[PDB]
């Protein structure tokens, strides 16, 4: 009936919506991984700046 096609329509709506939901989940997840790697290289930069600054200060 009209209820049947309405149900199938909201069904495929839910399907596409959860699909895009998981999709942006994955996208923002990759972005968070990239940002974590950024933080890691950032702490590497902090440590290297600290050691070279300390060497400069020692001399």
């Amino acid at each position: 009936d009209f209820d049947d096609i309405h149900r199938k329509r909201m069904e495929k709506d839910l399907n596409e919506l959860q699909a895009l939901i998981e999709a942006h989940f994955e996208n923002r997840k990759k972005e968070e991984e990239e940002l974590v790697s950024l933080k890691d290289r950032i702490e590497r930069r902090r440590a290297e700046r600290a050691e070279q600054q300390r060497i400069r200060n020692e001399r």
Binding site: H6, R7, M10, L14, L17, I21, E22
Partner: protein, 55 residues
Amino acid sequence: MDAIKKKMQMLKLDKENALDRAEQAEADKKAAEDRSKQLEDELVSLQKKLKGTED
């Protein structure tokens, strides 16, 4: 977020459809039972008329 809202909307469409069907069925029951009881009253009056005719 994004998918959560759509899933809630689906759960709400089910809500509206189920509730509407329940209300419509309840109205149908009320109408049908009123029909049956009025027919039964007509039957009773026919029995009484038959009794008067028998007298």
